[PDB]
Each structure stands twice: as structure tokens, then as C-alpha cells.
């Protein structure tokens, strides 16, 4: 899903969620989502390519 992340901010979601993965230790989708969820809408950028197991659990896609 596009999310609250347009084409330009699709380049910036990696930075938005980056602070969340950095909080756990890499793309730990169930982990970063807890912190990244503050970015209501760019989490959708995060789980976009990670649309699987936990993403459905993450509750995005």
C-alpha cells in the first residue's frame, strides 16, 4: 500500500521507520511497527515490501 508516503516520501519512509528498526536492530517488522506506528501511515511504507507473515500480524497489508 502507498500509505502516508508519496513517491518522494517513499524515499523518506526508509528514514521514518529507520528510527524504529534502529530501536530493535534492523527490519524487525513486529518490533519497529510498535515504535514506527507513531508514524501512522508511513508504517504502510515499511510493511509494503514486507507484506507477509507478520504484516498481517503487524496489521497493515
Only one residue has cell 497489508, namely 61
DSSP code, position 24: H
Domain carrying residue 25: 1-61
Which experimental approach was used here? NMR
- Total tally of structural domains belonging to the chain: 1
Residue 48 C-alpha cell reads as 509494503
Interruptions in the chain after residues (C–N over 2.5 Å): none
How many Cα atoms occupy the beta-carbon half-sphere of 44 within 13 Å? 11
**Are 16 and 36 a contacting pair, CB within 8 Å?**
yes
Neighbours of 11 (CB within 10 A): 11
Q: What's the CATH code of the domain at 18?
A: 1.10.10.1840
Amino acid at each position: 500500500a502507498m500509505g502516508k508516503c508519496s513517491v518522494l516520501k517513499k524515499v523518506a519512509c526508509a528514514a521514518a521507520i529507520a528510527g524504529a528498526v534502529a530501536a530493535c536492530g534492523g527490519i524487525d517488522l513486529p518490533c519497529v511497527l510498535a515504535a514506527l506506528k507513531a508514524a501512522e501511515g508511513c508504517a504502510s511504507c515499511f510493511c509494503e515490501d514486507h507484506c507477509h507473515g507478520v504484516c498481517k500480524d503487524l496489521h497493515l497489508c
